[PDB]
Design an enzyme around this catalytic site. Structure first.
Site, PDB file in Angstrom:
ATOM      1  CG  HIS B  29      -5.170   0.094  -4.901  1.00 46.28           C
ATOM      2  ND1 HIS B  29      -4.281  -0.069  -5.380  1.00 46.28           N
ATOM      3  CD2 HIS B  29      -5.703  -1.188  -4.335  1.00 46.28           C
ATOM      4  CE1 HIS B  29      -3.970  -1.349  -5.779  1.00 46.28           C
ATOM      5  NE2 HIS B  29      -5.065  -2.099  -5.128  1.00 46.28           N
ATOM      6  CG  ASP B  53      -1.730   2.160  -6.051  1.00 48.22           C
ATOM      7  OD1 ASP B  53      -2.063   2.585  -4.933  1.00 48.22           O
ATOM      8  OD2 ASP B  53      -2.127   1.023  -6.607  1.00 48.22           O
ATOM      9  N   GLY B 109      -6.952 -10.302  -3.673  1.00 46.59           N
ATOM     10  CA  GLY B 109      -6.308 -10.040  -2.413  1.00 46.59           C
ATOM     11  C   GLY B 109      -4.778 -10.115  -2.688  1.00 46.59           C
ATOM     12  CB  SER B 111      -2.713  -5.785  -4.920  1.00 46.20           C
ATOM     13  OG  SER B 111      -3.828  -5.417  -3.961  1.00 46.20           O
TER      14      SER B 111
END
EC number: 3.4.22.-
Lengths: 16, 151
Positions: B29, B53, B109, B111
């Site tokens: 993502h 993901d 910020g 991830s």
């Protein structure tokens, strides 16, 4: 577009 | 001096990537199907798994791969894009609860970053924060087992 690397993290805390 | 965790960046968004087993992993993502920049031109993802993901390129120069956890531990530590260490107790295969909930901005910020066990080894990649009213109290993560099989 493209993902660029803007910095780095060293987990060991090793100094340059 | 090499880093395991690179701080990456799209035009519209900024996150982290973690290098594990020679692959540079991060969240779908955030990267999408993008290419990672290099001094020799764009490099394409070795792995894309929109389901979990997860994307992975080859590890860039100036990187050092992290070792997959074998500690089995439930005491994780999340490293943020500011190099902050956040202790997290593990609740499930891919869920863990901050020991001290932080504002949501604190985890922002970060991830694609690593969850480490006590030995420093990778347990998973921080995937998304679970908030109640702006206060991150727990986190989702892609367990490293997923990375190892994606390969």
């Amino acid at each position: 577009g493209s993902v660029v690397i803007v910095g780095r993290i060293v987990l060991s805390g090793k100094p340059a | 001096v090499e880093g395991e965790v690179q701080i990456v960046s799209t035009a519209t968004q900024t996150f982290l990537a973690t290098c594990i087993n020679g692959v540079c992993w991060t969240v779908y993502h955030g990267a999408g199907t993008r290419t990672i920049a290099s001094p020799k031109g764009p490099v394409i993802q070795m792995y894309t798994n929109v389901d979990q993901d997860l994307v992975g390129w080859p590890a860039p120069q100036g990187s050092r791969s992290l070792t997959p956890c074998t500690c089995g531990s439930s005491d994780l530590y999340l490293v943020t894009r500011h190099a902050d260490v956040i202790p997290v107790r593990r609740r499930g295969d891919s869920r863990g609860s901050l020991l001290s909930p932080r504002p949501i901005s604190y985890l922002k910020g970060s991830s694609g970053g690593p969850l480490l066990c006590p030995a420093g080894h990778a347990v998973g990649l921080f995937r998304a924060a679970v908030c109640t009213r702006g206060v991150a109290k727990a986190v989702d993560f892609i367990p490293v087992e997923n990375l190892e099989t994606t390969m």
